[PDB]
Structure formats: C-alpha cells, structure tokens
Amino acid sequence: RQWALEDFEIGRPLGKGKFGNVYLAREKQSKFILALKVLFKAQLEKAGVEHQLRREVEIQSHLRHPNILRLYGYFHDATRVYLILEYAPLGTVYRELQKLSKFDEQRTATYITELANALSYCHSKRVIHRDIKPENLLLGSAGELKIADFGWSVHCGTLDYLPPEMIEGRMHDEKVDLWSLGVLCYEFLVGKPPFEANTYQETYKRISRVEFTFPDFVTEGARDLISRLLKHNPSQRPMLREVLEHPWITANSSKPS
Numbered sequence: 453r454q455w456a457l458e459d460f461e462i463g464r465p466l467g468k469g470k471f472g473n474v475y476l477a478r479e480k481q482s483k484f485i486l487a488l489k490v491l492f493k494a495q496l497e498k499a500g501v502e503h504q505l506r507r508e509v510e511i512q513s514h515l516r517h518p519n520i521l522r523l524y525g526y527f528h529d530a531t532r533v534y535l536i537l538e539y540a541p542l543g544t545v546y547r548e549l550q551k552l553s554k555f556d557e558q559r560t561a562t563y564i565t566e567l568a569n570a571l572s573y574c575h576s577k578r579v580i581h582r583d584i585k586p587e588n589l590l591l592g593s594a595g596e597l598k599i600a601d602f603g604w605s606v607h608c609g610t611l612d613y614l615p616p617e618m619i620e621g622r623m624h625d626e627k628v629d630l631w632s633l634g635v636l637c638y639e640f641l642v643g644k645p646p647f648e649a650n651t652y653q654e655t656y657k658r659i660s661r662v663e664f665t666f667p668d669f670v671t672e673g674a675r676d677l678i679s680r681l682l683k684h685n686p687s688q689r690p691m692l693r694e695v696l697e698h699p700w701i702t703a704n705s706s707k708p709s
C-alpha cells in the first residue's frame with residue numbers, strides 16, 4: 453500500500469527549514485490529519501545526508517512512544533522525498549519559551565520526566581539520541597512533549613546542546629542524553645541554555661570547561677539535578693532511573709514514569 457502526493461490534501465506551511473518544508477496535510481480517503489515533510493533529492497545528495505536520512509527514518513519507524521513524534525510512513529517521486537508524520541498541534545517548546553520567557557518548576561519537571569521516559573524507552577532499544585534542542589520538541593493536543601528530530605544512533609551546527617565529548621573529538625555513548633537533559637532543564641528554568649554565547653568559539657570553550665552559573669531564583673533541588681547532569685566525564689552522569697527518582701523531579705512533576 454504505497455502513498456503518492458495525490459493521496460493528500462495539502463494545508464498551510466507549518467515550518468520552513470534548510471532542507472525542506474513541512475505542511476499540515478490530510479489523507480483524502482481517511483481524512484487523517486498529519487504532517488508532511490517534503491525534501492528534494494538533489495539537495496540531500498549535494499549535502500551528502502541522503503543516507504543519513506535513510507538510517508534515521510529506518511530507526512524512527514521502530515520507535516513507538518507517547519513522547520516520541522511518530523513517523524507513519526514515507527514515499528518519493530522523481531525529485532522529492534516525503535515523510536508522513538504525526539501532527540503535534542500546540543507547536544514547539546522553543547516557541548513556548550519565547551512566549552513565556554521561562555518555565556516554572558512544575559512545567560519543567562514534567563517535561564524532564566517525559567523526556568527521561570522517552571529516552572529510557574530508547575535506551576532499552578539500544579537507541580541513543582544526539583543533542584536535543586527545544587526547536588525539535590513538539591507539543592501534542594494535551595500539551596504532552598514529543599521528541600521530533602531524527603537524531604538517533606545505534607552505536608556543525610550550533611554548539612549549545614552538544615556535550616564536551618562530542619565537541620572535543622572523543623568517544624560518546626548513551627550519557628550524551630543525560631547531558632541533554634541537564635542543558636534543557638537549565639534552559640526551561642532560566643530562559644537560555646547554560647553555555648550561550650555570541651560566538652561559536654566561546655560557546656566551545658564554555659562547554660569544554662563546563663563553565664556556567666545559576667541565577668539566584670534557581671532552587672537548591674534544580675541546582676543539584678542540573679549539576680549532576682552536566683558532568684564533564686560521561687561516566688559520572690547518573691542513569692535515567694536516578695533522574696526519574698530525583699526528589700526535585702518527584703516533588704514537582706505532574707506526570708509519572
């Protein structure tokens with residue numbers, strides 16, 4: 453049962469990226485509302501990411517979780533590749549941060565729990581994620597967080613969300629994901645990521661040194677969690693279990709494990 457472009461009514465543009473456009477779309481026969489990402493073969497090849505996309509699509513299709521954006525299917529015609537994706541109505545966590553400036557501790561701990569649950573599920577499937585950016589986190593109709601990128605591995609670019617071992621030219625494993633949780637926890641609470649700078653060169657130095665401070669309003673429990681996640685040595689970061697069992701998380705999160 454192969455899909456073609458004619459099987460979908462195309463709606464308004466959802467996002468405009470470097471590689472292609474994402475549209476709201478509705479499959480004609482079922483009236484199923486979904487997102488359609490359109491990519492040009494010529495452009496993926498010229499950047500040498502066609503294969504990379506194929507591997508990430510294949511990994512994605514194996515993933516089934518309420519907090520991971522679902523890939524339903526794919527197809528392609530003469531010049532274009534089409535990804536058929538779950539439509540998340542409430543948009544990105546990035547836009548929500550822009551509207552709200554920063555999040556309270558309850559929203560933040562809920563998002564972290566949801567992230568850690570999705571990542572726990574991924575780890576048990578030997579799936580590692582690369583850096584997790586807010587722009588790549590979507591919100592479902594009940595405001596549930598959805599990991600929406602395709603940055604998965606089975607064992608550049610802005611630096612803000614990358615761990616030291618990835619920038620220094622070192623060996624990286626599942627502990628990258630816990631650094632990611634650290635950066636996001638901080639950004640949710642503060643309104644910018646902990647190593648933000650005006651230049652790449654300086655962001656590099658800040659991440660490599662783990663050079664960041666907290667504003668005064670950050671509570672002791674949040675401080676404790678972020679500091680444990682942001683360890684330079686990957687093997688010193690806690691496990692996802694320990695994140696989900698952290699007192700600051702358990703005291704503030706609206707959602708369980």
Ligand SMILES: Cc1cc(Nc2cc(N3CCN(C)CC3)nc(Sc3ccc(NC(=O)C4CC4)cc3)n2)[nH]n1
Pocket residue numbers: 466467468474487489537538539540541542543544547587588590600601602
């Ligand atoms: C793919 C997708 C996108 C959506 N939903 C939305 C919804 C949205 N909104 C824009 C702002 N209004 C106020 C709310 C809805 N804005 C974007 S902007 C956007 C577009 C694409 C991606 N991500 C991807 O395409 C992933 C596959 C790599 C992230 C954000 N995406 N559901 N599914």
